[PDB]
């Protein structure tokens, strides 16, 4: 599913990401834009052999099982395919675990490099929330 900007904003807000661990909604929308272009089906291989899955590009090295990442934790107790569904619940629930683990949203390289320190509010401007 390729989300609209405000459509994803409203879905993440419904799932409680707005101000979760102090990260305003625009941070999560910005990160999704640059991680996945709002596309739940996005998959990308990392340098280390693992793969990133879904709207927030969650990694199989630690967070989900994709059956091909040696030394893999599955800390969200989920097949990585569950992160590709039109329903973003698994992605959001797993992301809440990641962002609660110490490094906040710096776990998302695209957030760190393209959202952090920017006007993340624009990403939810114009949305009815």
Q: Does 93 bind Na ion (CB under 5 A)?
A: no
Q: Which is nearer to Na ion, 36 or 69 (CB)?
A: 69
* Residue recorded with tokens 């710096």: 106
The answer to whether the CB of 29 falls within 8 A of the CB of 5 is yes
Q: Does 93 bind Cl ion (CB under 5 A)?
A: no
Q: Please, which residues have CB within 8 angstroms of residue 51's CB and are 6 or more apart in sequence?
A: 43, 44, 45, 59, 60, 66, 68, 69, 80
Q: Does 72 bind Na ion (CB under 5 A)?
A: yes
Site for Cl ion, residues 58 to 77, rule: CB under 5 A: 73-74
Our answer to whether residue 7 is catalytic in this structure is no
Q: Does 46 bind Cl ion (CB under 5 A)?
A: no
Identified catalytic residue from 7, 52, 87, 119: 52
Give the bridge partners for 52, in sequence order.
44, 59
Please give the positions annotated as active site: 35, 52
């Amino acid at each position: 599913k390729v989300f609209g900007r405000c459509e994803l904003a409203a879905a993440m807000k419904r799932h409680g990401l707005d101000n979760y661990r102090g990260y305003s909604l625009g941070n999560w929308v910005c990160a999704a834009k640059f991680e996945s272009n709002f596309n739940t089906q996005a998959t990308n291989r990392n340098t280390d052999g693992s793969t990133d899955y879904g709207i927030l590009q969650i990694n199989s090295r630690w967070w989900c099982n994709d059956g091909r990442t040696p030394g893999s934790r599955n800390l969200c107790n989920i097949p990585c395919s569950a992160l590709l569904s039109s329903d973003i619940t698994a992605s959001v629930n797993c992301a809440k675990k990641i962002v609660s683990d110490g490094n906040g949203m710096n776990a998302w390289v695209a957030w760190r490099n393209r959202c952090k320190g920017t006007d993340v509010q624009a990403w939810i401007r114009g949305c009815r929330l």
